[PDB]
């Protein structure tokens, strides 16, 4: 019995794109907030600085017209958010899952386990049930539904898949991460400027993987080896990110020091994960860093001394997709292996042997997955 | 990193102190929900409560707390924010008290805990209940957490199935498993257009249960109570839509079709075969049981289809009787009851003197969680 491997990665996004250059005009119009000149000026500066070029959203002017509470800050809107989210999350998840299954090239009857992560709505039965039904998976698949673990849940999903894959001979785990801003969209309000930071970054996306130990070569094709998977609570961080699931939807609150609480601690997380394999040069590694806005990626870069090369996959997904929550770190893994093939590098990890996937979110929580690349040549 | 199977090393339970006897619950319920005029619903509710075989339930919710949170007691009113204010702190707090009972039986420092699995459908926030009990128990900040939110009445099974893989794949791993439920998420006043509310109100109750799960016990402090042999999960065929729950502004709005009981009853034998065929076991009455007590009718129906005697189901029916339907926690209380009653009538194993047993989680999907268990001799389990 060996290490859990990534055998396939797939991604999906809803079709409707709003460019960041268009987004402030769009946002202030569909929330009937054009009278709030200062917030609109504040929001244009945040978006000009975001280094997100474009985002996909299921939410459109049409949907918001049909569900006006979603576009009114603090209005009872959760019922109508859930009516969207209950079906759109499994639906988008299925599309991401189909791309992974196609790459994998094996029948779906070989899938033994399903790990689904989202914070974009919830019901019983959950998105894990729904995607099982939509893909016609075996009814006896062993399911782990991961609700409401926010922007670190990509890490959590992989860490769970790792133990499922490694402890069960022949197990193939379908991992799906999906987010939909129907859960997080808020109109602007002078008292809750955290909303403007959210509306500059949050976006729709689904990513899927197939995880298995002991790949059947060469008809199965590993992309990454999962070596280790850690979770930690940052010291002195209690209350830094808090989200409530309220009648108005997901109401979230960020302290001033979120970026420096991650930044002053990330080096300790890298030592905890890499010391035992004798690694201390952080630029010797390839990276999937959760792109929770520009400031989080820049702070982690500054504190680890990461060069432009090691963050270009992370920054490409932030630019082209925005903060799709749990899905982002999986999009980055996809981008990383594609770019590696395109630039004729020796490994799926940008020519590097060892790598790091970092999930960041409430607690504050750091998810650290240690990866090895696979040869391309 | 294996060396052996995940064992239950400890079990502890906690309940809120306010108890309402079922004989008193219809008068309580119709009074606090301002529903005295709804006479036909009150008579229906009395008949359901009598048939329930729930004698007693624990609740955080009191008359006083409903007076301070009257939205909760007003059918369909926006109450979720008031429900989350209660549940955000009470679920981790109740989970903590259960965990402290399990950790005392375990007799190891909490620094030995490497993983935390927390199951609840009773409120949700970020960071979740996993984070909160980690903080309340002063666990090592680098514990590996699996937060199982909103899986409903099969989550007890899910929690052990996750714990099994965490404990068997990580050498030295000790998994704290906590299942907690609080009816602040599910409490609704009666309504002529939502009859399924009367079914839940007869059943749903508060409780927390905790386990320490680990492979390779270490004497003298650690003793196994149960061995986990296998953990299975399945969708009951032709079951789509039988149990639906939405998380709405009014709280958890749930819909329980009539045919839930036949769908579970008519497929449970296939679940037992799938789980026990490889061990050459077919005599369902020779096994010990923790069956999710999702109301009297589901237990009775599984009893009839498997041929289980009164002896097999007394632990299950004891918990339904004395605690009601505490959601995820029930199957863990029943394992606790089973080993306690075994020790008390001087049986030879923690499973009522039987060698093999099964824990059955039942919930939306419809989903069946099946945990294949082995008992431990009382000699090696007790002190």
* Full DSSP string of A109-148: GG--EEEEEE-S--EES-HHHHHHHHTT--TT-EEEEEES
What would the two tokens of residue A268 be? 């300790």
Q: Check if the beta carbon of residue A201 is closer than 8 Å to that of residue A52.
A: yes
Q: Under a CB-based contact definition with an 8 Å cutoff, are residues A375 and A347 in contact?
A: yes
A255 inside 8 A of chain B by CB: no
Two tokens, residue A2: 């060996």
| Residues B349/B377, Cβ–Cβ less than 8 Å | yes
Q: A122, B81: Cβ pair inside 8 Å? A: no
Distance (Å) from the alpha carbon of A199 to chain B's nearest alpha carbon: 19
CB-based contact A28:A41 (threshold 8 Å)? no
Cβ A148–B164 below 8 Å, yes or no?
Answer: no
Q: Is A142 in Cβ contact with B161 (below 8 Å)? A: yes
* B88 and B210 Cβ atoms separated by less than 8 Å: no
> What is the rounded CA–CA span in Å between residue B312 and residue B371?
16
What order do you get walking across the sheet with B175-181 strand by strand? Answer: B144-149, B115-120, B175-181, B207-214, B7-14, B226-235, B367-374, B356-363, B288-291
- B327 at interface of A, judged by CB pairs closer than 8 A: no
Question: Which among A159, A164, A168 has the least Cβ separation from residue B144?
Answer: A159
Contact B247 A141 (CB under 8 A): no
- Which residues in chain A touch residue B135, judged by CB atoms under 8 angstroms apart? 233, 238
- For A323, phi and psi rounded to 5 degrees? -85, 90
Chain A residues whose beta carbon lies within 8 Å of the beta carbon of residue B114? none
CB atoms < 10 A from the CB of A256, how many?
Answer: 8
B151 in contact with A, Cβ within 8 Å: yes
Chain B hits for A147, CB-CB cut-off 8 Å, are 124, 147, 149-150
The alpha carbon dihedral of A304, A310, A314, A315 has a sign of positive
Q: Which of B213, B232, B190, B184 is nearest to B367 (CA)?
A: B232
B247: which chain A residues are within 8 Å (Cβ-Cβ)?
A: 78, 82, 122-123, 245
Q: Can you read off the two tokens belonging to residue B109?
A: 């420092």
Q: For an interface test with A, which of B165, B240, B366 has the most A Cβ atoms less than 10 Å from its Cβ?
A: B165
Of B78, B150, B232, the CB nearest to A147: B150
The two tokens of residue A41 are: 């000026």
In angstroms, rounded to a whole number, what is the distance separating the alpha carbons of residues A351 and A349?
Answer: 5
Side-chain-facing half-sphere of B129: CA atoms under 13 Å? 34
Q: For residue B189, give the H/E element and its range.
A: none
- Measured in degrees and rounded to the nearest 5, phi and psi for residue A123 equal -155, 175
CA A279, A280, A284: angle at the middle one, nearest 5?
75
State how far the Cα of A137 lies from the Cα of A131, in Å rounded to an integer: 8
Residue with tokens 């237990």: B299
Asked whether the beta carbons of B122 and B185 are under 8 A apart, the reply is yes
How is chain B split into domains, by residue range? 6-215, 226-381
Contact yes or no for A297/A311 (Cβ under 8 A)? yes
Select from A160, A247, A361 the Cβ nearest to the Cβ of B249: A247
Cα gap B53→B235, rounded to integer Å: 28
Cα-Cα-Cα-Cα dihedral of A290, A295, A300, A303, to 10°?
Answer: 180
Method: X-ray
Sequence-distant (≥ 6) Cβ neighbours of residue B304 within 8 angstroms: B265
Residue of A nearest to B362 (CA): A125
The fold of B226-381 is: Peroxisomal Thiolase; Chain A, domain 1 (3.40.47)
Interface check for A78 against chain B (CB to CB < 8 A): the answer is yes
Class of domain A224-373: alpha beta
Rounded to whole angstroms, the Cα distance separating A367 from A158 reads: 10
Beta bridge partners of B149: B120
CB atoms within 10 A of CB B209: 32
Residue B111 neighbours by CB under 8 Å, 6+ apart:
B139, B140
The candidate with the shortest Cα–Cα distance to B153, out of B276, B341, B299, B41, is: B299
CA dist A269 and A151 (Å) reads: 17
Active site residues of A: 151
Q: How many CB atoms sit inside 10 A of residue B117's CB?
A: 27
Is A202 in contact with A20 (CB distance < 8 Å)? no
Query: Which of B76, B126, B240 to probe the A interface (max A CBs under 10 A)?
Result: B126
CB A208 within 8 A of CB A97: yes
> Is A167 close to B164, i.e. CB distance below 8 A?
yes
Write the class of the CATH domain B6-215. Answer: alpha beta
Q: Which residue does chain B place closest to A1, by CA atoms?
A: B1
Beta-sheet strand order (sheet of A354-361): A142-147, A113-118, A172-179, A205-212, A5-12, A224-233, A365-373, A354-361, A286-289
Whether B234 contacts chain A with CB within 8 A: yes
In whole angstroms, what separates CA A52 from the centre of its chain? 15
| Cβ of residue B260 closer than 8 Å to a chain A Cβ | no
Phi–psi pair at A205, nearest 5 degrees: -175, 150
Across chain B, the runs of DSSP E, i.e. the strands, are 7-14, 18-21, 56-59, 115-120, 125-126, 144-149, 175-181, 207-214, 226-235, 243-248, 251-256, 288-291, 356-363, 367-374
- Nearest chain B CA: its distance from A346 CA (Å): 31
Q: Distance of alpha carbon A362 from its chain centroid, rounded? A: 14
Bridge partners of residue A118, in order along the sequence = A147
Enumerate the H helices of chain A as residue ranges: 23-30, 37-49, 61-66, 78-104, 127-134, 153-167, 194-199, 258-274, 294-304, 308-321, 328-342
User: Chain B contact for A150, CB < 8 A?
Assistant: yes
Measured in angstroms, the CA of A38 and the nearest CA of chain B are apart by 30
Alpha helices in A187-305 (DSSP H): 194-199, 258-274, 294-304
User: Which single residue is written with the structure tokens 């940008």?
Assistant: A350
Chain B residues 99-128 with CB within 8 Å of chain A: 121, 124-128
Antiparallel, parallel or unpaired: β A286-289 and A17-19: unpaired
Considering only the C-alpha atoms of chain B, give the largest distance between any 2 of them, rounded to a whole number of Å: 64
Taking the Cβ of residue A149 and every Cβ of chain B, the question of whether any pair is shorter than 8 Å is answered with yes
Q: Residues 6 or more apart from A217 whose CB is under 8 A from it? A: none
B164 CB neighbours in chain A (<8 A) are 167
Cβ–Cβ of A149/B162 closer than 8 Å? no
Distance of residue B7 Cα from the nearest chain A Cα, in angstroms: 15
**Is A148 at the interface with chain B, CB within 8 A?**
yes
Measured from the Cβ of residue A98, the count of other Cβ atoms closer than 10 Å reads 16
Tokens of B304: 């009839």
Contacts of B128 in chain A (CB under 8 A): 148-149
Nearest to B56 by CA among B25, B95, B90: B25
Whether residue A362 and residue B235 make contact (CB cut-off 8 A), yes or no, is no
B365·A156 Cβ contact <8 A: no
- To the nearest whole Å, the CA of A150 is away from the closest chain B CA by 7
CA–CA gap between residue B186 and residue B247 (Å, rounded): 10
Q: Do B6-215 and B226-381 come out as alike in CATH topology? A: yes
What are the contacts of A337-343 at 24+ separation with CB within 8 A? A337/A9, A337/A223, A337/A224, A339/A312, A339/A313, A340/A373, A340/A376, A341/A376
Q: Which residues contact B237 (CB under 8 A, 6 or more apart)?
A: A139, B267
Strands A142-147 and A224-233: unpaired
Domain A4-213: which topology?
A: Peroxisomal Thiolase; Chain A, domain 1 (3.40.47)
Alpha carbon distances (Å) from A73 to A188, B13, B81, B298: 6, 42, 15, 44
- C-alpha to C-alpha distance for B378 and A239, rounded to whole angstroms: 46
Residue partners of B126: CB distance under 8 A and separation at least 6: A119, A148, A149, A150, A241, A242, A243, A252, A361, A362
CA distance B119 to B99: 13
Residue B194 backbone zone (phi > 0: left; psi -120 to 50: alpha; other: beta): beta
Q: Which tokens go with A176?
A: 């799906």
From chain B, the residues in CB contact with A130 under 8 A are none
Q: Which residues contact A7 (CB under 8 A, 6 or more apart)?
A: A103, A104, A172, A209, A210, A211, A212, A215, A220, A221, A222, A223
Question: Which two structure tokens, joined as six digits, stand for B19?
Answer: 């108890």
Residues 6+ apart with CB under 8 A from A194: A252, A253, A254
Structure tokens at A264: 């002053």
How far apart CA A270 and CA B86 sit, in angstroms, is 38
Q: Do B88 and A163 touch (CB under 8 A)?
A: no
Phi, psi for residue B166 in degrees, rounded to 5: -65, -45
Measured between CB atoms, which of B131, B234, B364 is closest to A124?
Answer: B364
DSSP B3: S
SS3 label, residue B350: coil
Q: Does A227 touch chain B (CB under 8 A)?
A: no
Interchain CB distance below 8 Å, A229 and B144: yes
Distance CA(A312)–CA(A335), nearest Å, equals 10
Using a CB–CB cutoff of 8 Å, tell me whether A257 touches chain B. no
Question: CA geometry: angle at B258 spanning B255 and B263, to 5°?
Answer: 105
Q: Helix count (H) and strand count (E) of chain B?
A: 12, 14
Which residues from chain A sit within 8 angstroms of residue B84, using beta carbons?
Answer: 244-246
| CB contact set of A35 (below 8 Å; sequence gap of 6+) | none
Q: How many CB pairs under 8 A join A and B?
A: 156
In angstroms, the CA A70 to CA B159 distance is 34
């Amino acid at each position: 019995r060996g290490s859990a491997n990534v055998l396939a990665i797939g991604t999906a996004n809803p079709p409707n794109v709003i460019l960041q250059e268009d987004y402030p005009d769009f946002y202030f119009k569909v929330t009937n907030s054009e009278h709030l000149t200062d917030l609109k000026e504040k929001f244009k500066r945040i978006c000009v600085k975001s280094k997100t070029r474009k985002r996909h959203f299921y939410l459109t002017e049409q949907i918001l017209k049909e569900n006006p509470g979603i576009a009114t800050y603090g209005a009872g809107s959760l019922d109508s958010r859930q009516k969207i989210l209950e079906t759109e999350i499994p639906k988008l998840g299925k599309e991401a899952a189909m791309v992974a299954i196609q790459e994998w090239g094996q029948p779906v009857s070989k899938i033994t386990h399903v790990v689904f992560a989202t914070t974009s709505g919830f019901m019983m039965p959950g998105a894990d049930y729904s995607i099982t039904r939509l893909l016609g998976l075996n009814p006896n698949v062993r399911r782990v539904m991961i609700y409401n673990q926010g922007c670190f849940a990509g890490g959590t999903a992989l860490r769970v898949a790792k133990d499922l894959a490694e402890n069960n001979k022949g197990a193939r785990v379908l991992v799906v991460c999906a987010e939909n801003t129907a859960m997080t969209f808020h109109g602007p309000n002078e008292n809750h400027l955290d909303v403007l930071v959210g509306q500059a970054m949050f976006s729709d996306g689904a990513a899927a993987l197939i995880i298995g130990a002991n790949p059947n070569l060469p008809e199965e094709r590993p992309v990454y080896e999962m070596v280790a998977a850690h979770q930690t609570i940052v010291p002195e961080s209690d209350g830094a990110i808090v989200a409530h699931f309220y009648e108005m939807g997901m109401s979230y609150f960020l302290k001033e020091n979120v970026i420096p609480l991650f930044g002053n601690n990330i080096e300790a997380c890298m030592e905890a994960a890499f010391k035992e394999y004798g690694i201390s040069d952080w630029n010797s590694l390839f990276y999937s860093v959760h792109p929770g806005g520009r400031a989080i990626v820049d702070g982690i870069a500054e504190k680890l001394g990461l060069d432009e090369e090691n963050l270009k996959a992370t920054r490409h997904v932030l630019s082209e997709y925005g903060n799709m929550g749990s899905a982002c770190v999986i999009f980055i893994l996809d981008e990383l292996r594609k770019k590696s093939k395109e630039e004729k590098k020796l490994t799926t990890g940008d020519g590097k042997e060892w790598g790091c996937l970092i999930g960041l979110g409430p607690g504050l929580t750091v998810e650290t997955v240690v990866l090895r690349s696979v040869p391309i040549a």
